[PDB]
Write a protein that binds this ligand. Structure first.
Ligand SMILES: Cc1cc2nc3c(=O)[nH]c(=O)nc-3n(C[C@H](O)[C@H](O)[C@H](O)COP(=O)(O)OP(=O)(O)OC[C@H]3O[C@@H](n4cnc5c(N)ncnc54)[C@H](O)[C@@H]3O)c2cc1C
Ligand SMILES: Cc1cc2nc3c(=O)[nH]c(=O)nc-3n(C[C@H](O)[C@H](O)[C@H](O)COP(=O)(O)OP(=O)(O)OC[C@H]3O[C@@H](n4cnc5c(N)ncnc54)[C@H](O)[C@@H]3O)c2cc1C
Ligand SMILES: Cc1cc2nc3c(=O)[nH]c(=O)nc-3n(C[C@H](O)[C@H](O)[C@H](O)COP(=O)(O)OP(=O)(O)OC[C@H]3O[C@@H](n4cnc5c(N)ncnc54)[C@H](O)[C@@H]3O)c2cc1C
Ligand SMILES: Cc1cc2nc3c(=O)[nH]c(=O)nc-3n(C[C@H](O)[C@H](O)[C@H](O)COP(=O)(O)OP(=O)(O)OC[C@H]3O[C@@H](n4cnc5c(N)ncnc54)[C@H](O)[C@@H]3O)c2cc1C
Lengths: 271, 273, 272, 273
């Protein structure tokens, strides 16, 4: 018995996004996983950070700062209960699946708000424990994305540009920052021009992948051990790691390109 | 100069914040050079950031199989979008300059600003598939990002723990603003604002107001022209085969997204050439 | 092996007579064993505006930008925008260049005008030592294929609009010959909008017939550059002894070099 | 005095002499109490390409599109793209139009060429019934202000490039006079990049001095339309009795109406009694 959380950000039960969530629950339950869901639209989830997220005494109500107040409110246990219930599902869960359509080169607004309200300091990150040292380093996360546009548009030579660049702020900035090991994303391009027989293959392919999802290699992010983790050094890359990397042709990752070339499909394929 | 309009979009809840100070300073400086200033303070408006069926107030084409792209476009052309959307679309049409003032939240825009883009930037109004990037509806307008961060600038340098800030800005500046046609100006990046002493904050404000006096004369950031690509479904919107041949031997790529497996031009998304 | 031809087309619509004239030219030329390459400017979404974005490297002086100086530096160090370079390579390869366009406001359409401005850079297409009949493209031939809505009487000597030879002069001499091209007799299709479908098909067949022997035609007469003093101190004026030889003739040399006298009949329309 | 002027400028750079000449013109005109409206085509990011996107309503025949027919229908039913309409309103208001541009390949720059093509629609700017001196703009005056890289000797009667009168003809007659404008003597500023700094200052002062009395100047001579038979059966040819009156003269009427004879000295550069 391991547990999985499936976060879904689509309003319509008639959608392929909903079909992909149902197929994931089917396949996982049948291998004996426990499955919990957050269907954000069906919950009427509130995505706006406000003062109403703290139900106790504010430290300084004349000069409100969400970072400081939310962290205090987590440690004394008076966060809004809608936030707390989501934090408990995450703690229980070993695997987290995010199922959403790509909207304006990012996550939908309602999923963005979920991250903002649920991933509070101390719970999901500290400045002492970032990246591969973060609270969620026992857990794995995977993005399941659908697009309206075709995969050629998001290739190296496409009108929109490299999909690896677009995924970087989400997979590194949000998921890995908090400690998750991030698996290869499930990219379903141009789903609205796909005939019915091909959609059935894609669903079967998804279910087949989930049977051994735990055994997969994760994506490569630069270990935090390559950097000086303190305020006086500037969180800069160590002088001896800069010397080792000077004469290599490739950079480390999409964000740590170091003025050089980006390793092919850094954010899409494991090494 | 006179007869020109500016829209200032603000995504912060608190009137005591530096983000609010930066909005007030921008309106002051712009009004004094004879601009008309219209505001969208998204928290003060109680703006609704969730796409739903309630955004269309008329007859749905197919209520059994609802698709937001198809329905929203129909609703725009027959003029029965929710009036909260229409009022924002009118400010955009009137405006020559658009300023986005927000704090960086999880390496992106706040959820409420993200929702504004989703509900207001409808097909036909803000983009068509026939008119993308530098051919888009908003090519007569200019946009600028004004961002504040909690972490210091060294953390977002080439060798910082978080990585290149140019990568982080790319999906917003290219994906959203340039896609719709905007000429995108150099972002105003105010790093580690909460750990800045009081006299330095005053300089930053004065620096912002000084820049806005001649904002219309600035060169925009470099994006790959759409003329380098075959813009139709059969070619895949790929870069033209003879432009791929001319670029094969160059050491640098074109932009952050069009790196072409090569090196990224220094500060492509932060400084104009 | 054989020879190459470039066809530049400036019309948006595939259902137009201009598009039919391009297809007919490619058909006829390919069948005589030419290699045929195209620049359909509207289908390419070609960008016709000169800007700084045309230089992709370091500008020499970004505070005081001058397109002539910067574009020439950028050509010699090889960091022009690749859309410009790809067009320059088709021109280098090409022996014959055909320009197919409708007359718009007594000139070329804006998109073709922009093509000239962005592609015909200094050093590549002209120097200063090498103007007119000494220019880089003196081994190549060019022809204008023009359509009008108005009839040919309107552009005759006594027409409301005036001599068509005057209208063609800035394009054929100012742009094409300046860079070295030998310029062939233009293909003028007057009043195409009142022509029935059977007559349009004859005009196309007439065009294809002309292209079978296009290389053997004599070019239009422009004044040789050898009649002028080619340096800054003399003002690039016509030599004093050539002014003396021409003083007592009744006709001038060309439309631009009329010399205050009569213009040779159809100087810009017919070869001698 | 209580009159309006439009200044069309076609240069990208604010550091240019073309920009200086526009600023000097606005200064001098405003000081004599003119209202001055501008079209800075590069600062507007003006779109110079005619397309179907210029008509925002229903096309008459989308299977066989013709820009002349459709644009004229779209003008009369009022669904032209608003970028076109805004420029047409400045022209309607304006009594004097000044075109400030550098000579590029013996003509106007591409962006100004496109402005003519998109803004000067049938019915608004010309009909086939009302051409030349009977056209819609016969109450207005227009003047060209041109700068060249080459020296004036090169564009003299005996210069390598040939007569400047011939080069100006398709623009001043073909575009401006065709629509009805009275055309004033062009302001020709030769070899501007090799002029010393004190001489550039004189040229500017000379320009400002000329604009003080610009309304009182005589226009250039074009052949009146009353000399021709204006109908399809006659071929719009010059009347048989006017050909008889001109048979004995040594000079022609204009650069385009040379009639196989000599061209009046500086027909397109200097006015006549
Ligand atoms: C505001 C907004 C912004 C957007 N921005 C972008 C962007 O930047 N980039 C981009 O590429 N796209 C963008 N999109 C488009 C978006 O990514 C796609 O519309 C979406 O991913 C398509 O997936 P869907 O789940 O909504 O499909 P649907 O069209 O709802 O479903 C796909 C098809 O599969 C069928 N189907 C349903 N259930 C099943 C089943 N069980 N088995 C088989 N077939 C089934 C459906 O009926 C339908 O025919 C945007 C959309 C919006 C609304
Ligand atoms: C959900 C969330 C996610 C975040 N994610 C990130 C992230 O990914 N990366 C990151 O780097 N940061 C992140 N942050 C931090 C965020 O960017 C900062 O908290 C924000 O930029 C601070 O800006 P502010 O306007 O709120 O400053 P405040 O703290 O509200 O104000 C700054 C200072 O200026 C003073 N001041 C106010 N008005 C004036 C005035 N008129 N003149 C002079 N001084 C004045 C204030 O009193 C204060 O001292 C996140 C924050 C949140 C809440
Ligand atoms: C901005 C602008 C400015 C202009 N300025 C001027 C000007 O200064 N002077 C001037 O004289 N005119 C001017 N015009 C008019 C212009 O010259 C004409 O409209 C143009 O020459 C017509 O050419 P086309 O190929 O577009 O004709 P179309 O109308 O496209 O073609 C004519 C007919 O041929 C048919 N056809 C197409 N292919 C075939 C085929 N294979 N076989 C048989 N029939 C076929 C078409 O269906 C059509 O009915 C201007 C027009 C514009 C838009
Ligand atoms: C594509 C192209 C095609 C061309 N074709 C032709 C052609 O066919 N024929 C031809 O003759 N030329 C041609 N040229 C050259 C062109 O006509 C000249 O470059 C142009 O006229 C120069 O004007 P400018 O305003 O750009 O000058 P600039 O070089 O911008 O200015 C000239 C000088 O004046 C100075 N200056 C600026 N402002 C002021 C001020 N307020 N007071 C005093 N001095 C000031 C500048 O700093 C500089 O020293 C072509 C150029 C291009 C780019």
């Amino acid at each position: 018995g391991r547990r999985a959380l499936i976060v879904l950000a689509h309003s319509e039960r008639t959608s392929f996004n909903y079909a992909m969530k149902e197929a994931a629950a089917a396949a996982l339950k049948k291998k004996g996983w426990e499955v919990v869901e957050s269907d954000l639209y069906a919950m009427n989830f509130n995505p706006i950070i406000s003062r109403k997220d703290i139900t106790g005494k504010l430290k300084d109500p004349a000069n409100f700062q969400y970072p400081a107040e939310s962290v205090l409110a987590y440690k004394e246990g008076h966060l809004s209960p809608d936030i707390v219930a989501e934090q408990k599902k995450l703690e229980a869960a070993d695997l987290v699946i995010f199922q959403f359509p790509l909207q304006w080169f990012g996550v939908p607004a309602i999923l963005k708000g979920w991250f903002e309200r649920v991933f509070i300091g101390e719970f999901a990150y500290t400045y002492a424990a970032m990246y591969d040292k973060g609270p969620f380093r026992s857990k794995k996360a995977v993005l399941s994305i659908t697009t309206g546009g075709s995969g050629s548009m998001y290739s190296l030579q496409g009108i929109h540009g490299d999909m690896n660049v677009i995924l970087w702020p989400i997979q590194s900035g949000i998921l890995h920052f908090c400690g998750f090991q991030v698996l290869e994303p499930q990219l379903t391009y141009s789903i609205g021009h796909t005939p019915a027989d091909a959609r059935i293959q894609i669903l079967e392919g998804w279910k087949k992948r989930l049977e051994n999802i735990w055994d997969e290699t994760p994506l490569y992010f630069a270990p935090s051990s390559l950097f000086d983790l303190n305020f006086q050094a500037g969180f800069l890359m160590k002088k001896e790691v800069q010397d080792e990397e000077k004469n290599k042709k490739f950079g480390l990752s999409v964000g740590h390109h170091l003025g050089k070339s980006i390793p092919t499909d850094n954010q899409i394929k494991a090494r």
